[PDB]
Design a protein around this ligand. Structure first.
Ligand code: GSP
Ligand code: FOK
Ligand code: CL
Ligand code: MG
Lengths: 334, 189, 190
């Protein structure tokens, strides 16, 4: 009875991509409904725009607008920033769109690593016009791109080929980690989730500690955990799209954060995605190898590590990789 | 059941625990919590085997609070009290390592007294071993009115730890229901 | 079983949890000798331990002057609420003779809630079968917010009483914060 099920645990830092993965499970393997998530997106929009403008002055150097008329909009936005039950009137959208057009405002969005900003910014702001319509129905991709932070443990049942899958979601942030233990015993396997893209950014929890390092350290915590000696960890090197983009952009260089990159040459076993740039391949694998160094150094073959290059916001790449995982689960566990 | 002259009682609770204990369907209605408690206790019990703590004799646990006493194995002079402290520092060593792996931040709050007790068995049914007397009450009240990450001792108990290389700051005064106001010390590190 | 130590704990619904404290334990401890106290205590709890087994209550522990058992263990009993109540009934009369005998005013403060518990043992060394849950936390607090020589019971411990005893407004929220903050309707038995 109890063995034909599988209890999977989703771990990783805050914003890594864990909630998006469970979402993809619903999109992939589960059965008015969404009208409530519209509000949620509206806030993503609000929180995103007001964050970009607030940042502008507190940057070094601070950023000026290319249209100083927009000041009054900037003024509008900041005046509504902390309003509790926001009415979302037609202005807000006109004003938000306006600012989002301002080349200066965008310039500040380029430096979005220098301050804490959600991942759905450029995406939703590019579609203000759609969201504002009173008859707005959010796409599947919209519900995926939305962001509500995880607070607590959340069981989610799905079934693939009559085989059963329990999935637990947890707070990736530090205050939240103290709940993880409540999933440790009986765990069929760990899915550790990593924002590959976040290599140029610091955690929310202290505005100083690098997100990917916090990721590396967190993994090392889990890999060498005392109650996880047996349990293997499938590694989702998430947000591969955002990584690729940053690498090609060539703005913030990797070796300027993780200087060992400077040495790294590309592996021999490398299987690059058809016509992916040698540079993106170089980058994505360095981050993989970073994680593997920790997994290599201990375990005794009592448990193993399975890397995967992934993009949670892409149901295409997720079906592929989650399937790569059932293979692994059904070999091992049996 | 026989009396004693100089027994050194210690209480070490983990007040941060009661908060952390939750009862959801996810955590088998709190079973996943009591699981972590067990680990902790067991980790503390693994200490008593250590050759240096062979005079330490665990009494019970009350909730998430560890009760232990030295000098029940009796008939230089108070080297046993110093062990008790030596032991309380060890619980913090173990509690600190649980934190590392449990992504938590449990502080231990200790109280160490000493003096006369009466040890023995109580209850007709399952006869279990315990210790009584005012020494124990105070020991307990040193814990409850304690401070996290600190050991609280009484005056004489302080004086002795002083004779053994321990430095002590005065905490102040405490109404111990029964004995009234008495002065207490934190053990410095 | 391999990575966590084996836990000797097991879920148990529909049980009732009594707690009983001695009122004026310090005044007694003041009067009589350091030793005679322990003998006046050991006598009473071995007297209690008889009553428990007759009333089908499995005694848990003595914690100084705090005594606590639970009905519904080891094997479930539908009298489980009546039993803890019945257990309390005796304790208030079992103290009565060993109160007059000492010439000092002591009584029992009783508190019974009902619900699920976990029960088992913690650690490796010096096992002592115990009970843990919010229902136990509540039980404990009922005794804490009890009335001298009276039995304090909860919403649920009436729902399992099947209306056989005559209760009265308890007012626990005004004698204990836990009860107030958690809006527990409490009662006293007549
Ligand atoms: N571009 C891109 N964005 C992603 C990807 N995966 C997740 N995101 C974005 O990251 C944001 C946060 O993701 P989320 O899944 O909520 O983090 P989390 O790990 O759950 O963090 P928490 O919920 O434990 S606090 C979302 O807005 C989502 O759109 C990805 O693969 N590519
Ligand atoms: C261990 C977890 C938890 C929450 C569960 C529980 O019911 C308790 O164990 C009781 C109530 C319970 O076990 C009955 C005895 C006693 C001694 C009264 C306990 C303490 O109050 C515990 O907390 C303390 C203070 O140790 C407490 C509350 O802790
Ligand atoms: Cl991350
Ligand atoms: Mg009392």
């Amino acid at each position: 009875v109890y063995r034909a099920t599988h209890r999977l645990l989703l771990l990783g830092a805050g914003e890594s991509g864990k909630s998006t993965i469970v979402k993809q499970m619903r999109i992939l393997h589960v059965n008015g409904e969404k009208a409530t998530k519209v509000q949620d997106i509206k806030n993503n929009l609000k929180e995103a725009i007001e964050t970009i403008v607030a940042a502008m002055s507190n940057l070094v150097p601070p950023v000026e607008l290319a249209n100083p008329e927009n000041q009054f909009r900037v003024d509008y936005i900041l005046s509504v920033m902390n309003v509790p039950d926001f009415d979302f009137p037609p202005e807000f959208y006109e004003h938000a769109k306006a600012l989002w057009e301002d080349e200066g405002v965008r310039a500040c969005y380029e430096r979005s690593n220098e301050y804490q900003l959600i991942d759905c910014a450029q995406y939703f702001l590019d579609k203000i016009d759609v969201i504002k319509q009173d008859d707005y129905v959010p796409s599947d991709q919209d519900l995926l791109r939305c962001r509500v932070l995880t607070s607590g443990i959340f069981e989610t049942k799905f079934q693939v080929d009559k085989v059963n899958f329990h999935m637990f979601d947890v707070g990736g942030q530090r205050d939240e980690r103290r709940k993880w233990i409540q999933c440790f015993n009986d765990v069929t396997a760990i899915i550790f989730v990593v924002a590959s893209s976040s290599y140029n950014m610091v955690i929310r929890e202290d505005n100083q500690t690098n997100r990917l390092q916090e990721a590396l350290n967190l993994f090392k915590s889990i890999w060498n955990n005392r109650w996880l000696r047996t349990i293997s960890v499938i590694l989702f090197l998430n947000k591969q799209d955002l990584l690729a983009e940053k690498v090609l952009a060539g703005k913030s260089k990797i070796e300027d954060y993780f200087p060992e990159f400077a040495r790294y040459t590309t592996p021999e076993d490398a299987t690059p995605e058809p016509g992916e740039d040698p540079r993106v391949t170089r980058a994505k694998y360095f981050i993989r190898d970073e994680f593997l160094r920790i997994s290599t150094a201990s375990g005794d073959g009592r448990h193993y590590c399975y890397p995967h290059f992934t993009c949670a916001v892409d149901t295409e790449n997720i079906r592929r990789v989650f399937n790569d995982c059932r293979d692994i689960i059904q070999r091992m566990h049996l | 059941h026989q009396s004693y002259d100089c027994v050194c009682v210690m209480f070490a609770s983990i007040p941060d625990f009661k908060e952390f204990y939750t009862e959801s369907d996810v955590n088998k209605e709190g079973l996943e919590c009591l699981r972590l408690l067990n680990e902790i206790i067991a980790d503390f019990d693994d200490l008593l085997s250590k050759p240096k703590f062979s005079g330490v004799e665990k009494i019970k646990t009350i909730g998430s609070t560890y009760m232990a006493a030295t000098g029940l194995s009796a008939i230089r002079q108070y080297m046993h009290i110093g062990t008790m402290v030596e032991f309380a520092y060890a619980l913090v060593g173990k509690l600190d390592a649980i934190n590392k792996h449990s992504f938590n931040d449990f502080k231990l709050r200790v109280g160490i007294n000493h003096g006369p007790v009466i040890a023995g068995v109580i209850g007709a049914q399952k006869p279990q071993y315990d210790i009584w007397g005012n020494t124990v009450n105070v020991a307990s009240r040193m814990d409850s009115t304690g401070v996290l990450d600190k050991i609280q001792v009484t005056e004489e108990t302080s004086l002795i730890l002083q004779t053994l290389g321990y430095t002590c700051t005065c905490r102040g005064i405490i109404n111990v229901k029964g004995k009234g106001d008495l002065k207490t010390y934190f053990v410095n590190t | 079983d391999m990575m966590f130590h084996k836990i000797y704990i097991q879920k148990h619904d529909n049980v009732s949890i009594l707690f009983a404290d001695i009122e004026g334990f310090t005044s007694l401890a003041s009067q009589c000798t350091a030793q005679e106290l322990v003998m006046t205590l050991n006598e009473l709890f071995a007297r209690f331990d008889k009553l428990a087994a007759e009333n089908h209550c499995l005694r848990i522990k003595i914690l100084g002057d705090c005594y606590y058992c639970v009905s519904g263990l080891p094997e479930a009993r539908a009298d489980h609420a009546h039993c803890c109540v019945e257990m309390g009934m005796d304790m208030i009369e079992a103290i009565s003779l060993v109160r007059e005998m000492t010439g000092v005013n002591v009584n029992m403060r009783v508190g019974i809630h009902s619900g699920r518990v976990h029960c088992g043992v913690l650690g490796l060394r010096k096992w002592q079968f115990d009970v843990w849950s919010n229902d136990v936390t509540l039980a404990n607090h009922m005794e804490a917010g009890g009335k001298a020589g009276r039995i304090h019971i909860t919403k649920a411990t009436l729902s399992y009483l099947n209306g056989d005893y005559e209760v009265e407004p308890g007012c626990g929220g005004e004698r204990n914060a836990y009860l107030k903050e958690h809006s527990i309707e409490t009662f006293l038995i007549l």
